[PDB]
DNA sequence: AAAAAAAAAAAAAAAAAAAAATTTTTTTTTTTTTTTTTTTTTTT
DNA sequence: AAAAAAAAAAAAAAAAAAAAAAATTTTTTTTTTTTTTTTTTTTT
């Protein structure tokens, strides 16, 4: 007779008059205005705050907080009452509840057996993401014994018939078909996270675990993000996980075996019904946020903007010595290198991609190698970089072989289709990719990485999936000189072991020469060791880390021209730079250093957000490639 | 017109069923074009000089001369086109009768349906409805013989168990042979059985529309009987079908959500 | 769609506007008056003249009786159609129209093969009638295979399931449940009649046959009652019985058997559905009457009685010496034995049963014992009596 | 001459016997592919 | 002559083909036993 869950009932009067009567700070209903939405297609969830929770009501919120699994039906059904009575909403649609600003926090460690089935959040690292699909919640069934049909069985993430045909003379509980029109589903991503480098214990992996997306956040999560996550930690059903037997369900019922027919073996355990018990942690994300937000929230980013972060951009770029300011705050641990803080500097800005009427896709990312005698912090810029952007990766020399490098395949474990697994450039895809002592990458992945700058793009075809990923992504490579020691009676080409067409491709060479001047010498100790001994001061960067990493993803968006008298300028300095040319540089001057002074003169019209490249900026580029290109020194 | 129930059992219910048959002759038979014109009939001249079997017809002018049909057409897809592959069939009959030996079945493409969604957004709620889509053909398989009207030797006594159709959901089985009655060990008859090309595409989001940090999606695709080898792999093309469910995709099997592939039965094919 | 038995709808057209036409000599519809009276449950049943649809037309009474048996259903359906068309009654209620005053006869013997179908109009004594029951007209069906309901498959006196499950994939011929509520029934009765005395041919038994009696008919006929079966010969199927083998019905696909399913012996006979066609003859009565008219409580004698022949009972009861006028009515050729007359005859108007207070019978009718030297007209007596 | 015992024939009912019957799923096997080690070969 | 780079080998893991493995009572027929009825043959 229909037996009432009394808590969860009274959770549910309690979060609708929540719903209906908590009013935000100017008086007005927020979750009333939140709850309008819902009626527009394409959206099944309300957002609210479990802040709001705890304000309006303490009780209900512990009580949510400690019995979040039974409760969560109950406040779907009180949103659907609270969205149903005042909007003429479809009658099927089904709705979600998301919290955020949850107060406590936990790790991946935390979350042990004794979280399950009760609200909790953590941070993760979202290794990849397989595809959307319509998952079953609600089945209906017809026995194929009687031609009954049995209707609203539920779904315990796993594949469910049900238990038994409602027909009490007919005990079907094999023969099944289920009728897919009348049941219904829910969009479904399954996701894969693992523990952010914070977290690790000593000598331990970065555990991983799966984390599933139901309808509405659901996209939301991409492979590479730092994403915080809330919900519930549920229990999957696993089966032949283990090749010793374990816990085993089976029925009560004390039946034994007639003679010819006996209870034993096989037969006997289809049965009895035995079964075994294995499950597996799979955490079910209510809400997804990223776990350092950006903003609060051209023209679009711009509108996201608030008020404050708006006028400080605003004020950045009015801000004349912005270009020195951001090398500091970018480095205030370097000293000198002021060329390479240069160069990286425009590297993070970037360039302008284009293409032809034809279809060459032009460059616009412009890659930088630092070459240069040992500790002379070329693994410490790109260190610096790694830290400080977003899309930001980070590999070594020959510690990525080839797969993990550029992309990966596996297939979908619950579907036929494949995953492409995202490697370092996918990931670094409109960002950075550091790579440290390039010179020493195996030819094999050399050239892989040298196709991914020729055509900012790779295509994967490997196991049975062919695809075309995209990586604009720019590469501030290090490279050690033979010898270990950088040699300037030579040429460059013949000081690093580089193939000719990635030398080629490379757009900024930066040498770094361990020269014995003691002055220099002395700056050098004074600086590093007054940064060990006031760590936490001894930093001024002008402008801190978000301040300029929120100036860059707003000046990204802006796409300079090229007007006609900064072209004329353009073209004679490159003449210049070709009479410079015609004693002889380390590496020769072609066409490609043009092309080189154009992205970085579009790459110096993107640091000061502007719809124009100037002289000034031509200018600039121009000496930072003439400065760039050293005389080879014949004694 | 339009009651309580859904718009798939009304249009399945037989009263609107010649109400919307009807609805489509008369178009086909009356608009005439922008210009006066009767395009229909040099559509249909061409596609009989050709035998091309299969009509295309364009959703603006369909949705602007009667948009009842327009709105049902996404809603329940599958009846609406069978039902106007009988009256394409009936009109070219009409226009020339000689056409009965030329394959008994025309295919309509609809063309330009207005809403296109994106590979990225394909959810439950276009589950069983004609949307347009864009991608590129990563791989195609070859041109495959499916059964479309299948008689099986009942190989207990070889009675010709008649022409079963084929529908593209679940395997037909027949029950048992109206001769020695037994649900006997029945196997196809390979020539009066009358198959029909199938071919296998599949289509994925292409990298100049996909966004910053991503993977391209990829949604198969089936081609039917006229539209086999109407893209090789790298085309860019749109694709208009009904995203499809109810085949036999599920992951009932053992270890695995209860989650279900999906399917585009394509229903035009537009390179770009 | 379909295709219609062209001639059984014309005719069915022509028999409505017989019923709708057709005066009596006042003017009034003497039928339009007798569907009215057909109201009434227990009153699912129109006696109809053949005289009266003669008098209608001509070739619509010579199709009639040469095919009645091709039309018969569309018969009833006119009557259905008929009576709905202008009254209210359960819209499941089946309307029988039986005929009556059909001029010619014929003799049991004279039922052959040429008579099978076309109406007939035969006369002989009753022997048995057997109870009252429903009969199946036409019942529906659940395949038990694919659960696919069957409407209305018409049975042909014979407990006949459907030739095959509706869903064309199933071929269900062998498996069926009769959803026996929502099937159709009628009252039915079978009474065994015989060829009388005068139609007997020389040397030879009575020819007896089991006539069927359907709606309305189906109590009124009864033991000894020399009644007139104005129906239809009819084959019905027969029994398993006949030892010579003889005309067999089979299938005409060609279809052979494969090496295993050999069609040779019973898997052969049953996958090919040989079976037997085997018949006797039964009479389809539609509605009986008495031989000889009887007379064309005591009010209801005077009632059922006509006016003449009320009259004549009237003033006869009244006239004085009945007593000898009755003795030589009843035996105008014996002479003598004139007491003896009398004492049968007072016999045969017999007396009063009476009953008590304690219920014990108390015989009225006399019993009346003739004793004598041979040849004395005892039989004569007797035979008088009998006839 | 009437009664009755026996005979053959016909029918009902209970016990035993007769007959009807492919489809779905799982597991071995083969075959390739990929990783990583080992080996061999070219260079300074 | 020894170091670096490349090629081949060895071994583990995965995907499909095709041969094996498993499940699996109920309804109809019909012979035999028993009783019953009409008749003929025999006895009182
Ligand atoms: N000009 C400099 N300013 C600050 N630190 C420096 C400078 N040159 C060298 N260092 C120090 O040298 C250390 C190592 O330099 P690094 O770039 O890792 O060497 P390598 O280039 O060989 O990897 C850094 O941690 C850094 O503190
Ligand atoms: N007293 C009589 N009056 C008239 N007819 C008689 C008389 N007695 C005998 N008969 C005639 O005798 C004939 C045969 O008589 P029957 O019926 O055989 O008598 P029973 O059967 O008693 O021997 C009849 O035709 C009958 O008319
Ligand atoms: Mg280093
Ligand atoms: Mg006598
Ligand atoms: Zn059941
Ligand atoms: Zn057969
Ligand atoms: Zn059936």
Same mark, same amino acid.
């Given at each position: 007779?229909?037996?009432?869950?009394?808590?969860?009932?009274?959770?549910?009067?309690?979060?609708?008059?929540?719903?209906?009567?908590?009013?935000?700070?100017?008086?007005?209903?927020?979750?009333?205005?939140?709850?309008?939405?819902?009626?527009?297609?394409?959206?099944?969830?309300?957002?609210?705050?479990?802040?709001?929770?705890?304000?309006?009501?303490?009780?209900?919120?512990?009580?949510?907080?400690?019995?979040?699994?039974?409760?969560?039906?109950?406040?779907?059904?009180?949103?659907?009452?609270?969205?149903?009575?005042?909007?003429?909403?479809?009658?099927?649609?089904?709705?979600?509840?998301?919290?955020?600003?949850?107060?406590?926090?936990?790790?991946?460690?935390?979350?042990?057996?004794?979280?399950?089935?009760?609200?909790?959040?953590?941070?993760?690292?979202? /290794?990849?993401?397989?595809?959307?699909?319509?998952?079953?919640?609600?089945?209906?069934?017809?026995?194929?014994?009687?031609?009954?049909?049995?209707?609203?069985?539920?779904?315990?993430?796993?594949?469910?018939?049900?238990?038994?045909?409602? *027909?009490?003379?007919?005990?079907?509980?094999?023969?099944?078909?289920?009728?897919?029109?009348?049941?219904?589903?829910?969009?479904?991503?399954?996701?894969?996270?693992?523990?952010?480098?914070?977290?690790?214990?000593?000598?331990?992996?970065?555990?991983?675990?799966?984390?599933?997306?139901?309808?509405?956040?659901?996209?939301?999560?991409?492979?590479?993000?730092?994403?915080? =996550?809330?919900?519930?930690?549920?229990?999957?059903?696993?089966?032949?996980?283990?090749?010793?037997?374990?816990?085993?369900?089976?029925?009560?019922?004390? /039946?034994?075996?007639?003679?010819?027919?006996?209870?034993?073996?096989?037969?006997?355990?289809?049965?009895?019904?035995?079964?075994?018990?294995?499950?597996?942690?799979?955490?079910?994300?209510?809400? /997804?946020?990223?776990?350092?937000?950006?903003?609060?929230?051209?023209?679009?980013?711009?509108?996201?903007?608030?008020?404050?972060?708006?006028?400080?951009?605003?004020?950045?770029?009015?801000?004349?010595?912005?270009?020195? *300011?951001?090398?500091?705050?970018?480095?205030?641990?370097?000293?000198?290198?002021?060329?390479?803080?240069?160069?990286?500097?425009?590297?993070?800005?970037?360039?302008?991609?284009?293409?032809?009427?034809?279809?060459?896709?032009?460059?616009?990312?412009?890659?930088?190698?630092?070459?240069?005698?040992?500790?002379?912090?070329?693994?410490?810029?790109?260190?610096?970089?790694?830290? =400080?952007?977003?899309?930001?990766?980070?590999?070594?020399?020959?510690?990525?072989?080839?797969?993990?490098?550029?992309?990966?395949?596996?297939?979908?474990?619950?579907?036929?289709?494949?995953?492409?697994?995202?490697?370092?450039?996918?990931?670094?895809? *409109?960002?950075?990719?550091?790579?440290?002592?390039?010179?020493?990458?195996?030819?094999?992945?050399?050239?892989?990485?040298?196709?991914?700058?020729?055509?900012?793009?790779?295509?994967?075809?490997?196991?049975? /999936?062919?695809?075309?990923?995209?990586?604009?992504?720019?590469?501030?490579?290090?490279?050690?000189?033979?010898?270990?020691?950088?040699?300037?009676?030579?040429?460059?080409?013949?000081?690093?072991?580089?193939?000719?067409?990635?030398?080629?491709?490379?757009?900024?060479? =930066?040498?770094?020469?361990?020269?014995?001047?003691?002055?220099?010498?002395?700056?050098?100790?004074?600086?590093?060791?007054?940064?060990?001994?006031?760590?936490?001061?001894?930093?001024?960067?002008?402008?801190?880390?978000?301040?300029?990493?929120?100036?860059?993803?707003?000046?990204?968006?802006?796409?300079?021209?090229?007007?006609?008298?900064?072209?004329?300028?353009?073209?004679?300095?490159?003449?210049?730079?070709?009479?410079?040319?015609?004693?002889?540089?380390?590496?020769?001057?072609?066409?490609?250093?043009?092309?080189?002074?154009?992205?970085?003169?579009?790459?110096?019209?993107?640091?000061?957000?502007?719809?124009?490249?100037?002289?000034?900026?031509?200018?600039?580029?121009?000496?930072?490639? *003439?400065?760039?290109?050293?005389?080879?020194?014949?004694? | 017109?339009?009651?309580?129930?859904?718009?798939?059992?009304?249009?399945?219910?037989?009263?609107?069923?010649?109400?919307?048959?009807?609805?489509?002759?008369?178009?086909?038979?009356?608009?005439?074009?922008?210009?006066?014109?009767?395009?229909?009939?040099?559509?249909?001249?061409?596609?009989?000089?050709?035998?091309?079997?299969?009509?295309?017809?364009?959703?603006?002018?369909?949705?602007?001369?009667?948009?009842?049909?327009?709105?049902?057409?996404?809603?329940?897809?599958?009846?609406?086109?069978?039902?106007?592959?009988?009256?394409?069939?009936?009109?070219?009959?009409?226009?020339?009768?000689?056409?009965?030996?030329?394959?008994?079945?025309?295919?309509?493409?609809?063309?330009?349906?207005?809403?296109?969604?994106?590979?990225?957004?394909?959810?439950?709620?276009?589950?069983?409805?004609?949307?347009?889509?864009?991608?590129?053909?990563?791989?195609?398989?070859?041109?495959?013989?499916?059964?479309?009207?299948?008689?099986?030797?009942?190989?207990?006594?070889?009675?010709?168990?008649?022409?079963?159709?084929?529908?593209?959901?679940?395997?037909?089985?027949?029950?048992?042979?109206?001769?020695?009655?037994?649900?006997?060990?029945?196997?196809?008859?390979?020539?009066?059985?009358?198959?029909?090309?199938?071919?296998?595409?599949?289509?994925?989001?292409?990298?100049?529309?996909?966004?910053?940090?991503?993977?391209?999606?990829?949604?198969?695709?089936?081609?039917?009987?006229?539209?086999?080898?109407?893209?090789?792999?790298?085309?860019?093309?749109?694709?208009?079908?009904?995203?499809?469910?109810?085949?036999?995709?599920?992951?009932?099997?053992?270890?695995?959500?209860?989650?279900?592939?999906?399917?585009?039965?394509?229903?035009?094919?537009?390179?770009? | 769609?379909?295709?219609?038995?062209?001639?059984?709808?014309?005719?069915?057209?022509?028999?409505?506007?017989?019923?709708?036409?057709?005066?009596?000599?006042?003017?009034?519809?003497?039928?339009?008056?007798?569907?009215? #009276?057909?109201?009434?449950?227990?009153?699912?049943?129109?006696?109809?003249?053949?005289?009266?649809?003669?008098?209608?037309?001509?070739?619509?009474?010579?199709?009639?009786?040469? #095919?009645?048996?091709?039309?018969?259903?569309?018969?009833?359906?006119?009557?259905?159609?008929?009576?709905?068309?202008?009254?209210?009654?359960?819209?499941?209620?089946?309307?029988?129209?039986?005929?009556?005053?059909?001029?010619?006869? !014929?003799?049991?013997?004279?039922?052959?093969?040429?008579?099978?179908?076309?109406?007939?109009?035969?006369?002989?004594?009753?022997?048995?009638?057997?109870?009252? !029951?429903?009969?199946?007209?036409?019942?529906?069906?659940?395949?038990?295979?694919?659960?696919?309901?069957?409407?209305?498959?018409?049975?042909?006196?014979?407990?006949?399931?459907?030739?095959?499950?509706?869903?064309?994939?199933?071929?269900?011929?062998?498996?069926?449940?009769?959803?026996?509520?929502?099937?159709?029934?009628?009252?039915?009765? &079978?009474?065994?009649?015989? %060829?009388?005395?005068? #139609?007997?041919?020389?040397?030879?038994?009575?020819? +007896?046959?089991?006539?069927?009696?359907?709606?309305?008919?189906? %109590?009124?006929?009864?033991?000894?009652?020399?009644?007139?079966?104005?129906?239809?010969?009819?084959?019905?199927?027969?029994?398993?019985?006949?030892?010579?083998?003889?005309?067999?019905?089979?299938?005409?696909?060609?279809?052979?058997?494969?090496?295993?399913?050999?069609?040779?012996?019973?898997?052969?006979?049953?996958?090919?559905?040989?079976?037997?066609?085997?018949?006797?003859?039964? $009479?389809?009565?539609?509605?009986?009457?008495?031989?000889?008219?009887?007379?064309?409580?005591?009010? +209801?004698? &005077?009632?059922?009685?006509?006016?003449? #022949?009320?009259?004549?009972?009237?003033?006869?009861?009244?006239?004085?010496?009945?007593? !000898?006028?009755?003795?030589?009515?009843?035996?105008?050729?014996?002479?003598?034995?004139?007491?003896?007359?009398?004492?049968?005859?007072?016999?045969?108007?017999?007396?009063?049963?009476?009953?008590?207070?304690?219920?014990? +019978?108390?015989?009225?009718?006399?019993?009346?014992?003739?004793?004598?030297?041979?040849?004395?007209?005892?039989?004569? $007596?007797?035979?008088?009596? %009998?006839?």
């Amino acid at each position: 007779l229909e037996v009432r869950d009394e808590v969860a009932e009274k959770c549910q009067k309690l979060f609708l008059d929540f719903l209906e009567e908590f009013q935000s700070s100017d008086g007005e209903i927020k979750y009333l205005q939140l709850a309008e939405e819902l009626i527009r297609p394409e959206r099944n969830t309300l957002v609210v705050s479990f802040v709001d929770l705890e304000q309006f009501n303490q009780q209900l919120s512990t009580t949510i907080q400690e019995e979040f699994y039974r409760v969560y039906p109950y406040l779907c059904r009180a949103l659907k009452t609270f969205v149903k009575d005042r909007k003429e909403i479809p009658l099927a649609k089904d709705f979600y509840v998301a919290f955020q600003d949850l107060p406590t926090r936990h790790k991946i460690r935390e979350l042990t057996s004794s979280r399950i089935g009760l609200l909790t959040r953590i941070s993760g690292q979202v /290794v990849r993401t397989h595809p959307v699909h319509p998952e079953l919640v609600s089945g209906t069934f017809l026995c194929l014994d009687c031609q009954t049909v049995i209707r609203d069985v539920e779904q315990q993430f796993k594949y469910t018939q049900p238990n038994i045909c409602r *027909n009490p003379v007919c005990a079907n509980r094999r023969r099944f078909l289920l009728d897919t029109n009348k049941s219904r589903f829910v969009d479904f991503q399954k996701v894969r996270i693992q523990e952010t480098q914070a977290e690790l214990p000593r000598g331990s992996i970065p555990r991983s675990l799966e984390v599933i997306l139901r309808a509405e956040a659901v996209e939301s999560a991409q492979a590479g993000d730092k994403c915080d =996550f809330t919900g519930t930690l549920i229990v999957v059903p696993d089966v032949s996980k283990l090749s010793t037997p374990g816990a085993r369900a089976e029925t009560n019922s004390r /039946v034994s075996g007639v003679d010819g027919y006996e209870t034993e073996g096989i037969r006997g355990l289809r049965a009895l019904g035995v079964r075994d018990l294995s499950y597996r942690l799979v955490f079910l994300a209510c809400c /997804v946020a990223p776990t350092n937000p950006r903003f609060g929230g051209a023209e679009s980013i711009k509108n996201q903007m608030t008020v404050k972060e708006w006028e400080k951009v605003f004020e950045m770029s009015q801000d004349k010595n912005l270009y020195h *300011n951001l090398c500091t705050s970018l480095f205030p641990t370097i000293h000198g290198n002021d060329e390479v803080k240069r160069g990286v500097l425009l590297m993070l800005f970037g360039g302008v991609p284009k293409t032809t009427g034809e279809g060459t896709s032009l460059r616009g990312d412009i890659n930088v190698c630092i070459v240069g005698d040992p500790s002379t912090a070329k693994s410490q810029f790109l260190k610096h970089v790694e830290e =400080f952007s977003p899309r930001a990766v980070y590999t070594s020399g020959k510690a990525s072989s080839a797969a993990g490098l550029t992309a990966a395949v596996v297939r979908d474990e619950e579907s036929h289709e494949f995953v492409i697994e995202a490697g370092a450039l996918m990931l670094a895809d *409109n960002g950075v990719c550091c790579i440290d002592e390039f010179d020493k990458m195996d030819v094999r992945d050399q050239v892989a990485i040298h196709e991914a700058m020729e055509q900012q793009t790779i295509s994967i075809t490997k196991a049975g /999936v062919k695809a075309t990923l995209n990586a604009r992504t720019s590469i501030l490579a290090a490279a050690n000189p033979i010898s270990g020691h950088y040699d300037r009676s030579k040429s460059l080409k013949q000081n690093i072991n580089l193939s000719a067409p990635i030398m080629s491709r490379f757009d900024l060479f =930066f040498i770094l020469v361990d020269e014995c001047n003691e002055v220099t010498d002395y700056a050098i100790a004074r600086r590093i060791v007054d940064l060990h001994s006031r760590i936490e001061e001894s930093i001024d960067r002008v402008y801190s880390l978000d301040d300029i990493r929120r100036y860059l993803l707003f000046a990204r968006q802006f796409k300079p021209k090229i007007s006609k008298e900064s072209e004329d300028f353009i073209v004679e300095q490159y003449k210049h730079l070709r009479q410079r040319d015609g004693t002889k540089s380390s590496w020769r001057i072609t066409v490609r250093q043009l092309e080189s002074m154009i992205r970085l003169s579009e790459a110096m019209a993107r640091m000061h957000c502007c719809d124009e490249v100037q002289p000034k900026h031509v200018k600039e580029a121009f000496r930072l490639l *003439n400065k760039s290109i050293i005389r080879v020194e014949t004694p | 017109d339009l009651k309580g129930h859904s718009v798939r059992e009304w249009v399945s219910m037989a009263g609107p069923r010649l109400e919307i048959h009807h609805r489509f002759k008369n178009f086909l038979r009356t608009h005439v074009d922008s210009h006066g014109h009767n395009v229909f009939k040099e559509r249909i001249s061409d596609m009989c000089k050709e035998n091309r079997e299969s009509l295309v017809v364009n959703y603006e002018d369909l949705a602007a001369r009667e948009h009842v049909l327009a709105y049902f057409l996404p809603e329940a897809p599958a009846e609406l086109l069978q039902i106007f592959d009988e009256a394409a069939l009936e009109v070219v009959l009409a226009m020339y009768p000689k056409y009965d030996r030329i394959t008994n079945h025309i295919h309509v493409r609809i063309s330009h349906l207005p809403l296109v969604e994106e590979l990225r957004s394909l959810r439950q709620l276009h589950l069983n409805q004609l949307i347009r889509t864009s991608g590129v053909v990563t791989s195609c398989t070859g041109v495959l013989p499916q059964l479309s009207m299948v008689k099986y030797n009942c190989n207990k006594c070889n009675f010709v168990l008649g022409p079963f159709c084929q529908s593209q959901n679940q395997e037909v089985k027949p029950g048992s042979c109206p001769e020695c009655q037994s649900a006997g060990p029945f196997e196809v008859n390979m020539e009066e059985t009358i198959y029909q090309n199938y071919q296998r595409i599949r289509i994925q989001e292409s990298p100049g529309k996909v966004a910053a940090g991503r993977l391209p999606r990829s949604k198969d695709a089936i081609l039917l009987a006229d539209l086999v080898d109407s893209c090789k792999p790298g085309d860019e093309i749109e694709l208009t079908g009904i995203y499809h469910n109810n085949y036999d995709g599920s992951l009932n099997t053992a270890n695995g959500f209860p989650v279900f592939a999906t399917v585009i039965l394509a229903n035009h094919v537009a390179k770009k | 769609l379909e295709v219609r038995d062209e001639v059984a709808e014309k005719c069915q057209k022509l028999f409505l506007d017989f019923l709708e036409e057709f005066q009596s000599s006042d003017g009034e519809i003497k039928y339009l008056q007798l569907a009215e #009276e057909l109201i009434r449950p227990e009153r699912n049943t129109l006696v109809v003249s053949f005289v009266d649809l003669e008098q209608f037309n001509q070739q619509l009474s010579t199709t009639i009786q040469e #095919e009645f048996y091709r039309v018969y259903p569309y018969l009833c359906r006119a009557l259905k159609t008929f009576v709905k068309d202008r009254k209210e009654i359960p819209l499941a209620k089946d309307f029988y129209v039986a005929f009556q005053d059909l001029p010619t006869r !014929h003799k049991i013997r004279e039922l052959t093969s040429s008579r099978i179908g076309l109406l007939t109009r035969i006369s002989g004594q009753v022997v048995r009638t057997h109870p009252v !029951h429903p009969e199946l007209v036409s019942g529906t069906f659940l395949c038990l295979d694919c659960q696919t309901v069957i409407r209305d498959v018409e049975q042909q006196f014979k407990y006949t399931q459907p030739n095959i499950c509706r869903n064309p994939v199933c071929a269900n011929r062998r498996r069926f449940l009769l959803d026996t509520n929502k099937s159709r029934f009628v009252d039915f009765q &079978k009474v065994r009649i015989q %060829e009388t005395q005068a #139609e007997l041919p020389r040397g030879s038994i009575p020819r +007896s046959l089991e006539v069927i009696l359907r709606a309305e008919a189906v %109590e009124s006929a009864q033991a000894g009652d020399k009644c007139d079966f104005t129906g239809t010969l009819i084959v019905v199927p027969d029994v398993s019985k006949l030892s010579t083998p003889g005309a067999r019905a089979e299938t005409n696909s060609r279809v052979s058997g494969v090496d295993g399913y050999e069609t040779e012996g019973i898997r052969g006979l049953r996958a090919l559905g040989v079976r037997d066609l085997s018949y006797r003859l039964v $009479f389809l009565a539609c509605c009986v009457a008495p031989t000889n008219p009887r007379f064309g409580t005591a009010e +209801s004698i &005077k009632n059922q009685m006509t006016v003449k #022949e009320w009259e004549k009972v009237f003033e006869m009861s009244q006239d004085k010496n009945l007593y !000898h006028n009755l003795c030589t009515s009843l035996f105008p050729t014996i002479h003598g034995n004139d007491e003896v007359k009398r004492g049968v005859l007072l016999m045969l108007f017999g007396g009063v049963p009476k009953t008590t207070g304690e219920g014990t +019978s108390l015989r009225g009718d006399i019993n009346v014992c003739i004793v004598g030297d041979p040849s004395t007209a005892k039989s004569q $007596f007797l035979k008088h009596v %009998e006839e």
